């Protein structure tokens with residue numbers, strides 16, 4: 001029932017009790033581990049509301065108080081009559097913060113308690129949504145001194161009146177198929193880009209064209225809006241030693257801001273809830289630039305360094321990969337935009353992990369995602385056993401709106 | 408019921424049915440994934456199901472399932488179990504068993520090679536001296552003057568659990584570690600305790616950074632005995648870098664033959680508790696883990712110093728820079744001496760090919776992502792992007808506790 005996790009580098013052993021308060025299903029069974037898989041009513045809502053309010057009132061040291069019981073009856077009275085309910089502001093801030101605290105795939109959670117929450121539940125139209133989003137972006141960006149934030153639109157009602165940001169991130173580069181055969185810009189965003197064009201976007205058709213927002217309010221057909229270019233902080237990519245690096249013409253945006261996830265608090269579902277923090281360096285240098293399925297620039301860079309690409313055993317990909325990632329961290333720092341390197345991020349997460357074990361009895365963590373996509377074993381997280389389980393409140397994936405929403 | 412795995416780089420989708428033939432548990436539940444946890448006497452009753460299961464497998468593969476000779480072998484194993492409470496594998500079943508344990512080893516990236524295993528049968532062995540000789544011959548055959556060949560040597564099975572054959576070494580060739588009174592270690596820090604054991608069994612320690620440990624060998628549940636591997640048999644490679652000439656002055660070498668000697672081979676219910684096996688190295692095993700782990704030789708600083716990197720902020724990626732150079736050096740040194748080695752790009756790529764082939768012909772390939780993805784440069788290898796299903800097939804290799812923790816000393 002109780003479980004041990006061992007760090008194999010420090011021999012430190014921790015005991016997890018938090019997993020018994022775990023609720024949703026993992027995908028795994030006694031017969032099969034699915035750890036590496038990316039995606040494995042009134043009667044339903046009240047248990048969910050109760051479990052959430054119980055943890056809320058317990059966190060404020062008021063479990064079994066008058067204010068507790070009374071709130072429990074009030075939600076019950078709202079559920080029985082309205083078939084949903086409304087979170088108080090204080091409950092909403094707690095819910096969002098804990099959804100982040102519980103995100104087993106996030107290395108950045110040491111910061112969980114500093115989330116700035118923007119309550120956009122009074123929003124009704126896409127122009128309304130656009131305004132809230134620009135305020136989010138500007139607030140979070142802070143001229144390069146980035147701050148964590150989430151903006152929460154109105155919750156699901158009947159599932160015919162959903163608020164959705166169709167973009168997967170608020171700031172992303174477009175993807176275009178060429179008559180040539182290959183791809184200009186980000187090949188990850190090719191489909192969405194075509195949905196932007198088919199909705200009426202004028203695409204400049206270059207390598208780094210910031211996509212327009214596609215916003216859906218109250219189940220309506222979604223609407224295009226360009227983000228004020230003055231709000232999109234971007235960094236030109238140079239290397240501190242290699243002069244030729246700048247003429248690759250690389251740039252990235254400072255603000256990572258996930259906008260396609262669904263926030264669940266006390267059985268209530270918030271389908272538009274964009275959140276943003278700041279980058280770990282490898283997210284851009286390793287994944288965005290070097291993934292065969294992304295900008296895939298390793299070939300071009302290795303060529304500029306004059307490495308031996310005759311054989312894989314010269315480790316030329318690995319050499320180029322390090323430099324690319326050195327260039328990313330350097331560029332961001334030189335422009336004073338917050339960024340964390342993978343050594344720093346993982347060390348902080350080990351500190352966070354040990355904080356959560358002593359202060360909560362555990363910390364759900366997905367090793368496959370926490371271990372950075374380069375230099376895994378030289379980061380302390382590699383040697384750290386982790387337990388993965390699903391707690392609520394949480395962020396969940398949701399189907400893309402275009403596969404679903406009717407026109 | 409059929410399960411799909413997706414490669415997120417290529418969008419290739421594969422369908423697994425083999426997991427239906429899975430028996431043992433994984434450690435996971437619907438409520439918890441233990442996918443990153445390192446370690447999560449039998450009765451007649453259970454033994455015949457296991458035998459039957461295995462012989463059904465064996466006879467299926469040779470296309471003799473249900474034949475007179477398959478039936479006769481069931482009846483004969485049946486009888487042997489009730490008459491003696493155990494049974495004996497035929498030669499052909501042993502081979503086959505051993506190849507399939509490797510094949511089913513979900514943490515091993517080297518399985519494309521599974522069908523080429525040299526099996527040595529050492530089931531006539533009765534003494535520690537007998538074991539030394541079998542192991543020497545193993546090492547010589549597998550080494551093949553640098554042109555490494557996979558091999559397994561199999562000693563007699565467990566009977567009552569009181570008469571076990573064990574190789575107390577975790578690997579047949581490994582370097583000593585010696586903790587000093589000042590708190591530092593000389594040599595491989597992983598081996599400190601096994602070293603102490605060898606010392607107190609009578610090994611007179613040379614006490615250098617690279618002393619090849621003696622073999623400590625238990626036969627027939629007896630106390631084990633010391634033996635030096637003949638040095639002419641221990642192929643070693645001095646480590647140098649193709650461009651950095653100060654690299655050899657670091658004084659590093661490594662042995663060429665990785666040979667795991669602490670695992671338990673389970674086939675058709677029988678337990679072979681000494682089955683050392685050996686292959687060749689993937690370069691990252693030496694350059695990333697053996698040299699650069701903080702708990703191992705820990706040379707990153709010393710190398711980054713000599714490279715004059717900016718070491719005053721981790722954000723210079725000095726560790727990542729030094730790590731790549733050391734790994735370049737390891738592959739360079741092995742190749743120049745014509746000792747078999749494989750780089751991680753080449754090994755992960757071959758494994759992906761192995762894996763797809765296994766889905767087509769076998770209906771699955773159990774694989775453990777945490778272990779298969781290399782400890783550097785993860786996402787630039789094709790495995791990082793491969794979803795994988797992990798489950799337990801038999802025959803298999805299993806962990807077993809360290810013999811010094813369980814052994815009843817006789818004197």
Ligand code: HEM
Nearest residue numbers: 100103105106107108111148149275276277278279280395
């Ligand atoms: C503050 C700095 C932050 C850092 C350094 C960070 C880091 C990361 C990283 C590296 C990943 C894996 C990303 C990938 O490779 O695609 C991740 C995933 C995730 N992060 Fe954090 N994050 C931060 C802020 C936040 C915030 C503010 C939230 C929510 C409030 C959050 C919630 C999540 C969630 C839900 C995932 C999983 C997404 C998925 O499953 O695809 N993060 N994070």
Ligand code: HEM
Nearest residue numbers: 509512514515516517520557558684685686687688689804
């Ligand atoms: C021939 C070349 C081979 C290569 C390149 C190879 C590669 C590897 C690597 C890199 C690992 C885990 C890395 C680590 O040590 O942490 C591993 C694990 C393993 N290998 Fe292979 N291997 C090879 C041959 C074999 C052979 C001959 C066998 C047995 C017949 C075998 C069975 C296993 C087993 C059972 C594990 C799991 C070990 C554990 O769970 O700790 N391998 N292999």
Ligand SMILES: Cc1cc(N)nc(C[C@@H]2CNC[C@H]2NCCNCCc2cccc(F)c2)c1
Nearest residue numbers: 038108256257258275276277278279280283415
């Ligand atoms: C808030 C925040 C801060 C930060 N530093 N980092 C993040 C990572 C985002 C989250 N989620 C994707 C990451 N961004 C990477 C963009 N690629 C898509 C990821 C993906 C791939 C395959 C399947 C799938 F469903 C999603 C968020």
Ligand SMILES: Cc1cc(N)nc(C[C@@H]2CNC[C@H]2NCCNCCc2cccc(F)c2)c1
Nearest residue numbers: 008445517665666667684685686687688689806
């Ligand atoms: C035959 C062969 C060839 C090859 N290239 N490679 C191998 C890897 C061996 C097998 N298995 C690990 C490697 N041997 C190293 C010892 N393992 C330390 C990590 C560890 C820590 C704690 C518990 C545990 F189970 C393992 C074998």
Ligand SMILES: C[C@H](O)[C@H](O)[C@H]1CNc2nc(N)[nH]c(=O)c2N1
Nearest residue numbers: 382383384385443444445777778
């Ligand atoms: C905690 C974690 O599972 C452990 O450190 C594992 C991770 N992956 C590994 N993978 C390999 N190949 N070898 C190892 O020793 C480990 N260590």
Ligand SMILES: C[C@H](O)[C@H](O)[C@H]1CNc2nc(N)[nH]c(=O)c2N1
Nearest residue numbers: 036037038368369791792793794
């Ligand atoms: C197949 C595998 O699950 C997949 O490629 C995962 C592995 N780990 C990851 N880890 C992070 N942080 N981000 C990712 O997108 C992925 N992709």
Ligand SMILES: [Zn+2]
Nearest residue numbers: 028033435440
């Ligand atoms: Zn699992």
